[PDB]
Design an enzyme around this catalytic site. Structure first.
Site, PDB file in Angstrom:
ATOM      1  N   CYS B   1      11.686 -30.797  51.518  1.00 35.77           N
ATOM      2  CA  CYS B   1      12.744 -31.098  50.561  1.00 35.77           C
ATOM      3  C   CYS B   1      12.152 -31.376  49.182  1.00 35.77           C
ATOM      4  CB  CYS B   1      13.573 -32.292  51.031  1.00 35.77           C
ATOM      5  SG  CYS B   1      14.946 -32.700  49.935  1.00 35.77           S
ATOM      6  N   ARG B  32      16.744 -36.817  46.284  1.00 36.71           N
ATOM      7  CA  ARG B  32      17.285 -35.688  47.026  1.00 36.71           C
ATOM      8  C   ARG B  32      17.555 -36.010  48.490  1.00 36.71           C
ATOM      9  NH1 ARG B  32      17.426 -31.041  44.810  1.00 36.71           N
ATOM     10  NH2 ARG B  32      16.497 -30.616  42.756  1.00 36.71           N
ATOM     11  N   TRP B  95      13.281 -33.242  54.760  1.00 32.77           N
ATOM     12  CA  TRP B  95      14.642 -33.360  55.274  1.00 32.77           C
ATOM     13  C   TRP B  95      14.699 -32.519  56.546  1.00 32.77           C
ATOM     14  CZ3 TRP B  95      18.414 -36.531  55.321  1.00 32.77           C
ATOM     15  CH2 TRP B  95      19.669 -36.138  55.804  1.00 32.77           C
ATOM     16  N   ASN B 122       9.205 -26.442  51.791  1.00 32.95           N
ATOM     17  CA  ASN B 122      10.621 -26.700  51.565  1.00 32.95           C
ATOM     18  C   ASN B 122      11.403 -25.473  52.012  1.00 32.95           C
ATOM     19  OD1 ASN B 122      10.051 -29.196  50.481  1.00 32.95           O
ATOM     20  ND2 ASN B 122      10.340 -28.566  48.343  1.00 32.95           N
ATOM     21  N   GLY B 123      12.266 -25.646  53.009  1.00 30.19           N
ATOM     22  CA  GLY B 123      13.109 -24.559  53.463  1.00 30.19           C
ATOM     23  C   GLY B 123      13.047 -24.325  54.956  1.00 30.19           C
ATOM     24  N   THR B 358      33.063 -29.726  42.072  1.00 33.35           N
ATOM     25  CA  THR B 358      33.415 -30.270  40.764  1.00 33.35           C
ATOM     26  C   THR B 358      33.210 -29.247  39.654  1.00 33.35           C
ATOM     27  OG1 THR B 358      33.020 -32.578  41.378  1.00 33.35           O
ATOM     28  CG2 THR B 358      32.770 -32.010  39.045  1.00 33.35           C
ATOM     29  N   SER B 359      32.194 -28.391  39.775  1.00 33.08           N
ATOM     30  CA  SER B 359      32.008 -27.338  38.784  1.00 33.08           C
ATOM     31  C   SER B 359      33.226 -26.423  38.728  1.00 33.08           C
ATOM     32  CB  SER B 359      30.743 -26.541  39.095  1.00 33.08           C
ATOM     33  OG  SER B 359      29.593 -27.365  39.005  1.00 33.08           O
ATOM     34  N   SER B 403      27.359 -24.279  37.340  1.00 30.45           N
ATOM     35  CA  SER B 403      26.516 -24.890  38.366  1.00 30.45           C
ATOM     36  C   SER B 403      25.559 -25.866  37.696  1.00 30.45           C
ATOM     37  CB  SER B 403      25.756 -23.820  39.141  1.00 30.45           C
ATOM     38  OG  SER B 403      24.851 -24.406  40.058  1.00 30.45           O
ATOM     39  N   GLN B 404      25.727 -27.156  37.989  1.00 28.99           N
ATOM     40  CA  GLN B 404      24.783 -28.157  37.505  1.00 28.99           C
ATOM     41  C   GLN B 404      23.364 -27.827  37.958  1.00 28.99           C
ATOM     42  OE1 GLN B 404      22.144 -31.105  36.976  1.00 28.99           O
ATOM     43  NE2 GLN B 404      22.795 -30.730  39.090  1.00 28.99           N
ATOM     44  N   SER B 405      23.186 -27.578  39.256  1.00 30.26           N
ATOM     45  CA  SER B 405      21.856 -27.321  39.800  1.00 30.26           C
ATOM     46  C   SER B 405      21.371 -25.909  39.503  1.00 30.26           C
ATOM     47  CB  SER B 405      21.854 -27.544  41.313  1.00 30.26           C
ATOM     48  OG  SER B 405      22.655 -26.571  41.963  1.00 30.26           O
ATOM     49  N   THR B 408      23.301 -23.339  43.742  1.00 32.56           N
ATOM     50  CA  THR B 408      24.297 -23.349  44.806  1.00 32.56           C
ATOM     51  C   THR B 408      24.468 -21.952  45.391  1.00 32.56           C
ATOM     52  OG1 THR B 408      25.418 -25.135  43.621  1.00 32.56           O
ATOM     53  CG2 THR B 408      26.634 -24.047  45.404  1.00 32.56           C
ATOM     54  N   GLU B 536      39.784 -33.524  40.540  1.00 33.84           N
ATOM     55  CA  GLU B 536      38.440 -34.076  40.405  1.00 33.84           C
ATOM     56  C   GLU B 536      38.411 -35.555  40.771  1.00 33.84           C
ATOM     57  OE1 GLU B 536      35.604 -33.239  40.319  1.00 33.84           O
ATOM     58  OE2 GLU B 536      34.495 -34.987  39.592  1.00 33.84           O
ATOM     59  N   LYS B 540      36.259 -37.213  43.874  1.00 38.07           N
ATOM     60  CA  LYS B 540      35.332 -38.325  43.684  1.00 38.07           C
ATOM     61  C   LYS B 540      35.617 -39.450  44.666  1.00 38.07           C
ATOM     62  CE  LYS B 540      32.523 -36.891  40.766  1.00 38.07           C
ATOM     63  NZ  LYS B 540      32.732 -35.627  41.526  1.00 38.07           N
ATOM     64  N   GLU B 543      34.525 -38.461  48.054  1.00 39.11           N
ATOM     65  CA  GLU B 543      33.082 -38.327  48.227  1.00 39.11           C
ATOM     66  C   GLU B 543      32.381 -39.680  48.198  1.00 39.11           C
ATOM     67  OE1 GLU B 543      31.195 -36.236  45.034  1.00 39.11           O
ATOM     68  OE2 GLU B 543      29.646 -35.378  46.331  1.00 39.11           O
ATOM     69  N   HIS B 559      58.926 -29.695  46.113  1.00 41.98           N
ATOM     70  CA  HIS B 559      58.781 -28.601  47.063  1.00 41.98           C
ATOM     71  C   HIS B 559      58.168 -29.045  48.388  1.00 41.98           C
ATOM     72  CE1 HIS B 559      59.956 -25.708  43.997  1.00 41.98           C
ATOM     73  NE2 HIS B 559      59.104 -26.284  43.169  1.00 41.98           N
ATOM     74  N   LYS B 658      24.178 -29.666  59.021  1.00 44.30           N
ATOM     75  CA  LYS B 658      24.274 -29.616  60.471  1.00 44.30           C
ATOM     76  C   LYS B 658      23.161 -30.444  61.107  1.00 44.30           C
TER      77      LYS B 658
HETATM   78  N1  LIG Z   1      59.989 -24.184  51.931  1.00 39.94           N
HETATM   79  C1  LIG Z   1      59.653 -25.469  51.354  1.00 39.94           C
HETATM   80  C2  LIG Z   1      58.371 -25.987  52.007  1.00 39.94           C
HETATM   81  O1  LIG Z   1      58.561 -26.099  53.390  1.00 39.94           O
HETATM   82  C3  LIG Z   1      59.447 -25.339  49.841  1.00 39.94           C
HETATM   83  O2  LIG Z   1      58.086 -25.462  49.536  1.00 39.94           O
HETATM   84  C4  LIG Z   1      59.931 -23.988  49.324  1.00 39.94           C
HETATM   85  O3  LIG Z   1      59.049 -22.983  49.741  1.00 39.94           O
HETATM   86  C5  LIG Z   1      59.956 -24.049  47.803  1.00 39.94           C
HETATM   87  O4  LIG Z   1      60.953 -24.948  47.397  1.00 39.94           O
HETATM   88  C6  LIG Z   1      60.245 -22.666  47.228  1.00 39.94           C
HETATM   89  O5  LIG Z   1      61.555 -22.283  47.538  1.00 39.94           O
HETATM   90  P1  LIG Z   1      61.948 -20.685  47.410  1.00 39.94           P
HETATM   91  O6  LIG Z   1      61.158 -19.883  48.414  1.00 39.94           O
HETATM   92  O7  LIG Z   1      63.424 -20.514  47.673  1.00 39.94           O
HETATM   93  O8  LIG Z   1      61.625 -20.205  46.017  1.00 39.94           O
HETATM   94  N1  LIG Z   2      28.355 -32.711  42.830  1.00 37.07           N
HETATM   95  C1  LIG Z   2      29.510 -32.598  43.703  1.00 37.07           C
HETATM   96  C2  LIG Z   2      30.715 -33.159  42.952  1.00 37.07           C
HETATM   97  O1  LIG Z   2      30.809 -34.530  43.216  1.00 37.07           O
HETATM   98  C3  LIG Z   2      29.725 -31.145  44.159  1.00 37.07           C
HETATM   99  O2  LIG Z   2      31.088 -30.872  44.319  1.00 37.07           O
HETATM  100  C4  LIG Z   2      29.157 -30.115  43.183  1.00 37.07           C
HETATM  101  O3  LIG Z   2      29.971 -30.026  42.048  1.00 37.07           O
HETATM  102  C5  LIG Z   2      29.127 -28.776  43.906  1.00 37.07           C
HETATM  103  O4  LIG Z   2      28.284 -28.887  45.021  1.00 37.07           O
HETATM  104  C6  LIG Z   2      28.586 -27.709  42.960  1.00 37.07           C
HETATM  105  O5  LIG Z   2      27.235 -27.970  42.707  1.00 37.07           O
HETATM  106  P1  LIG Z   2      26.549 -27.281  41.382  1.00 37.07           P
HETATM  107  O6  LIG Z   2      27.313 -27.710  40.148  1.00 37.07           O
HETATM  108  O7  LIG Z   2      25.107 -27.723  41.279  1.00 37.07           O
HETATM  109  O8  LIG Z   2      26.622 -25.778  41.521  1.00 37.07           O
HETATM  110  N1  LIG Z   3      12.126 -26.656  57.939  1.00 34.74           N
HETATM  111  C1  LIG Z   3      11.082 -27.671  57.621  1.00 34.74           C
HETATM  112  C2  LIG Z   3      11.228 -28.158  56.178  1.00 34.74           C
HETATM  113  C3  LIG Z   3      12.620 -28.664  55.829  1.00 34.74           C
HETATM  114  C4  LIG Z   3      12.695 -29.242  54.431  1.00 34.74           C
HETATM  115  O1  LIG Z   3      12.246 -30.391  54.232  1.00 34.74           O
HETATM  116  O2  LIG Z   3      13.199 -28.542  53.526  1.00 34.74           O
HETATM  117  C5  LIG Z   3      11.166 -28.849  58.584  1.00 34.74           C
HETATM  118  O3  LIG Z   3      12.225 -29.138  59.140  1.00 34.74           O
HETATM  119  O4  LIG Z   3      10.178 -29.541  58.826  1.00 34.74           O
END
Ligand SMILES: N[C@@H](CO)[C@@H](O)[C@H](O)[C@H](O)COP(=O)(O)O
Ligand SMILES: N[C@@H](CO)[C@@H](O)[C@H](O)[C@H](O)COP(=O)(O)O
Ligand SMILES: N[C@@H](CCC(=O)O)C(=O)O
Lengths: 657, 663
Positions: B1, B32, B95, B122-123, B358-359, B403-405, B408, B536, B540, B543, B559, B658
């Site tokens: 990691c 991290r 990790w 890493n990976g 968030t992006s 993308s902040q990082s 992604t 957003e 937050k 999360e 609706h 996972k």
């Molecule tokens: N069916 C309702 C949700 O169960 C409601 O969201 C509905 O879809 C919405 O009011 C739009 O109505 P419409 O299909 O007659 O335009």
């Molecule tokens: N940082 C998280 C927001 O709280 C997450 O949703 C993030 O925005 C998402 O994983 C995208 O990451 P990135 O901006 O580095 O691409």
């Molecule tokens: N796959 C390696 C490295 C994982 C990592 O730290 O990115 C391990 O599990 O040991």
């Protein structure tokens, strides 16, 4: 909201036969608004019905219609035995989006403490505040906070300053609507004009039914401009006639199938039992009463879920031919060519109708190869979204009257776009004002939560997609695959419905929970959004749809052994990704219910609770995967003691702000 | 990691100083997340450093880096005072993915009981099953359940089967990576190549910092394909002294040097005799570039958490995002990163914003002003769904990747999807050298500083400002929009002070946190410019607080979702002074009518709603297309305070991938 009135001209009805007709009319309209109700009839207890038209009685009460049905009865002053040869009665059920649903705010409104004019209104007056200040200076006192009261206090102001002693009731109403801004559908009644009703509309539905054992003088009432026997609709030789003012056709089909759909600024007026329009076509309704009856089901929503095998078939009837694999939507024959020369598809709708676009966006992109954008109507308007002349804009609306969807339509027309209507209501605003469209033909939907409307819209958009690619050699096999799926879809829906009991059992394990997360991706993004909305709407649990691919970016933190989770994992090209999302949920100690395919043995072995649905084509599977969530929402609501047809805090079809 | 290696070449360092440098390197990588760490260094206590180059010592341990530091100084048989003129130490935070956390499964992984080769990784090596079987058939015994061990055993297999006695360390590693499948960043060390280092990557970041008091031979290292002489590599000119820092994150290098080389996929970087060369299987090369990053930017300072710091420093980060790009003196906007492409972009016909989490909300938050000022269709796409649908893309599309990082996976794959279809690609990133900043035709560095906190705070608002600035460029030739541009830019001028004003209401937000302390759900309702604020804020609170917060588009209440409102459901509504004000008031009346008692975020001067609503968070008024920045900060603080009240560590990730495959 709902409007209903019963005018029996020389058809003797006792005071009970009339009230039971007003209540029975509101019951047909209750699904449009059930926060309060009210009726307006003639009072007095004189044997001679003529000496009673000078006394107006108003019975208004909070609650559904069944709360008013009992308030009307067991009263100590009204004798329900007076025979009326001529009589007019107006009724109304209200959707109290603002303020309290008190009897003072329910309709009919009144113009004074003696009830000289009473009006029932569907819509909004955008300048009632100005009208309220003008009427208060002239000597009128207001009691309620509704915009409808400014219509009653004003029709009396035009009556207190008329030029001749006998100005027609039409002239008084005509002067009112000229001071009203916005949309409205009105039905007036006054002691000064006994038995006379006036029905004008502007941006809101309002028809007039008619029944009579005698022959009618015409079938095309000529609109007039500021009235003889060759102008009004009436029985020829005799006077026996019964009218039925109503904002919808379901309240009139039970009594007759002969209505006259009015138009904007048409001021209908029944005088001496003769219907004349001021400023038409007496036609037969294509609806059977059975279509608006629960049948043997305990609720409309349950019927409409279990009837989806039929409504799906009705959506494809006369449009899909499985012998030669052809698709023809008559509503688009004169525009399909020009639609293909356009460069972008925009789907605009609200709520579940918006989800139908999400559910078909992918296959629309696949078979048309065009950019497909799906927009929530309210946000579409807020942003002044760019639209161009070579855009094709679809408007999905079961009711065809939804305010935001309808304003988006007029927004797109102003910019020269080609507009298409996907509706379930013939003659609705959206079906009329679009260049073309398709009637999904799912039958009337009475339940507030749309079920068959969603699956029928789904199928309708798939059929459109099949037309758009019917000239591509490379897509012929793909078309065949899809159309065979459509042929087998009604029976696979039946298979899903046979798991009703298995769904109910799982509901017993969740009804006590406060939240549930529904996770899916690809074709089943819409499924988890629609399922989350259904559980919100009728069960009141905090259910949320989460795009499975987005779990790792934050929402997964909310998952633990206590948080209920439902995942959708179907055998399409995202199966592996769905399995990763499932493994992530389990790592967080989640114990999810997985909606999966019957043959998905791997998922079924490693998951305790699984809802095993049959496999269909990937772009149709969303129809099968959403039905269990329809059923689940239903059972959860029953377990929690709620009504599935009348969910709190709203009604069906949002036709105002 | 986390990877960090320190190579001192003719810069005398004691064993203590080397170990303190490795530990300090891993401390910059802890944010991290990790479950174990280890170091690899030359053992032996012969006073002459030249003889100890054949004894590699390892100290690996499960736990936090602090425990590893204690284990280092807790060695009775190790003398920390030996001075090394030349030495290579390597360090790693793990990790776990393959093999449970443990000392044996920690890095560096070794090639044999004598540590002839060690490697930090890493990976994940996908084909580690096949590779393990092959090496076991050739007589190599494995001691760990990690995929990484196959890398250490395989490099010894290539060494054991080398054709000549003097095959280069690089050649061995090249043959290794040609058999590996998956993603990896690697640093190798071996007793057979004392003082030398080899770094390589594929799908994982790896950079090299350099420091020397002497002039360096070049600032552009040319690639060598399969002669290494003085005209082809990096080295101090008149003397030998030099220091190299391998790292997977610049945060571990910046305190020593700001001169770095970002390696690319399949690069094999080698240090031989203190000279850095880059091998690969006009003239392409790798630049020695200067990072504007500072150690202070990755330290808490006086704040008790990185979340608190990065929220409260947003007045500064917004200013940093605008520096050198907005001229309030004459109302002009210049994003230097788009100079050579703004002309093409203005000839395109559609903007597509592609991002995750968030992006993505940053795109939703600026969609309207982009539509207004560009007049082009603006489509905002969640990257995962964008890929699932095979979305149609065309040569005249302009595709933005937020993308902040800058790494992604789904966003990066969306980028490569759009490039294949001929679209003009634009990177909006916050990480120099990241994949998305490199592979886009052009880009903008939002320059918010590194984001060390788990949640995106300043990155969101800096992305917000960056997209507004781009919108201001796209309409700079329109007479009819001059006034609107001036209004927006005066808003940006006042925005840093308005953020401070919002941050000064922290006490009011704490009161709201205590009101929601015991609550399990909260609905956050808004529309228009503040739809993104609801989404957003809801993300937050999910999360950071682990409660069920959900963003609901106000226009959709009637609706269906309005059924959730009653006297018990907590609700937060956003009602600002823009063109949707009346519609927002309507939504408020709808909620109240159903016994809802919501908390309203509104303008300071909205006297009507403040009187008719019990608890209101009163933010200052700004331009309508900028209010989203002010209305989201109270929700950032709310999530922060709720988590603190509930005893959570806001700088702890929690969100793990996972489970660990034990095999
Ligand atoms: N069916 C309702 C949700 O169960 C409601 O969201 C509905 O879809 C919405 O009011 C739009 O109505 P419409 O299909 O007659 O335009
Ligand atoms: N940082 C998280 C927001 O709280 C997450 O949703 C993030 O925005 C998402 O994983 C995208 O990451 P990135 O901006 O580095 O691409
Ligand atoms: N796959 C390696 C490295 C994982 C990592 O730290 O990115 C391990 O599990 O040991």
């Amino acid at each position: 909201c709902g409007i209903f009135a019963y005018l029996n001209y020389h058809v003797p009805r006792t005071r009970r036969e009339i009230l039971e007709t007003l209540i029975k009319g509101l019951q047909r309209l209750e699904y449009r608004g059930y926060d309060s109700a009210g009726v307006g009839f003639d009072g007095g207890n004189d044997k001679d019905w003529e000496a009673n038209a000078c006394k107006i009685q108003l019975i208004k009460k909070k609650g559904k219609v069944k709360a008013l049905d009992e308030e009307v009865h067991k009263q100590q002053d009204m004798d329900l035995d007076i025979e009326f040869d001529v009589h007019l009665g107006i009724a109304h059920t209200r959707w109290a989006t603002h303020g309290e649903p008190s009897p003072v705010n329910s309709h009919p409104q009144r113009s004074d403490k003696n009830n000289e004019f009473i009006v029932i209104h569907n819509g909004i007056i955008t300048n009632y505040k100005d009208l309220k200040k003008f009427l208060e200076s002239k000597g009128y006192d207001f009691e309620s906070e509704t915009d409808t009261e400014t219509i009653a206090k004003l029709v009396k102001y035009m009556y207190d300053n008329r030029e001749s002693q006998d100005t027609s009731f039409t002239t008084l109403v005509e002067r009112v609507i000229q001071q009203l801004e916005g949309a409205f559908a009105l039905v007036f009644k006054s002691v000064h004009f006994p038995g006379q009703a006036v029905g004008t509309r502007r941006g809101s539905p309002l028809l007039i039914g008619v029944r009579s054992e005698h022959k009618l003088s015409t079938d095309h009432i000529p609109i007039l401009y500021r009235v003889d026997s060759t102008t009004c609709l009436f029985p020829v030789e005799e006077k026996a006639v019964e009218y039925y003012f109503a904002s919808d056709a379901s309240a009139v089909i039970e009594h007759t199938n002969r209505v006259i759909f009015l138009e904007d600024d048409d001021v209908a007026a029944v005088v001496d039992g003769r219907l004349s329009i001021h400023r038409r076509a007496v036609q037969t309704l294509q609806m059977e009463l059975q279509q608006i009856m629960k049948g043997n089901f305990s609720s409309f929503m349950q019927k409409e879920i279990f009837e989806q095998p039929e409504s799906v078939v009705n959506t494809m009837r006369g449009r899909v031919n499985f012998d030669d694999y052809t698709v023809n939507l008559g509503g688009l024959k004169d525009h399909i060519k020009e639609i293909q020369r356009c460069r972008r598809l925009i789907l605009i709708a609200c709520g579940t109708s918006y989800h139908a676009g999400v559910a078909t966006r992918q296959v629309l992109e696949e078979l048309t190869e065009l950019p497909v954008m799906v927009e929530l109507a309210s946000d579409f308007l807020d942003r002044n979204t760019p639209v161009f002349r070579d855009d094709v804009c679809f408007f999905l609306s079961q009711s065809g009257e939804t305010a935001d969807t309808l304003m988006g339509l007029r927004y797109c027309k102003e910019r020269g776009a080609l507009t298409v209507g996907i509706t379930n209501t013939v003659g609705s605003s959206i079906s009329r004002e679009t260049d073309c469209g398709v009637h999904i033909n799912a039958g009337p939907e009475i339940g507030v939560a749309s079920t068959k409307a969603y699956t029928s819209q789904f199928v309708s958009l798939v059929m459109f997609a099949l037309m758009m690619c019917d000239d591509r050699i490379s897509m012929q096999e793909r078309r065949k695959e899809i159309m065979l799926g459509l042929k087998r879809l009604p029976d696979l829906i039946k298979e899903v419905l046979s798991m009703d009991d298995e769904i109910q059992k799982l509901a017993t394990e969740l009804y006590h929970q406060k939240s549930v997360l529904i996770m899916g991706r690809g074709y089943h993004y819409a499924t988890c959004l629609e399922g989350a909305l259904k559980i919100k709407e009728i069960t009141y649990m905090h259910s949320e749809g989460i795009l499975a691919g987005e779990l790792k970016h934050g929402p997964l933190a909310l998952v633990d052994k206590l948080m209920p989770v439902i995942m959708i994992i179907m055998r399409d090209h995202t199966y592996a990704k769905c399995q990763n999302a499932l493994q992530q949920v389990v790592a967080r100690q989640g114990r999810p219910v997985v909606i999966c395919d019957k043959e998905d043995t791997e998922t079924i072995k490693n998951t305790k609770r699984t809802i095993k649905v049959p496999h269909s084509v990937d772009c149709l599977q969303g129809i099968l995967s959403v039905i269990p969530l329809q059923l689940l929402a239903f059972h959860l609501a029953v377990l929690r003691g709620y009504d599935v047809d009348f969910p709190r805090n709203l009604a069906k079809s949002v036709t105002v702000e």
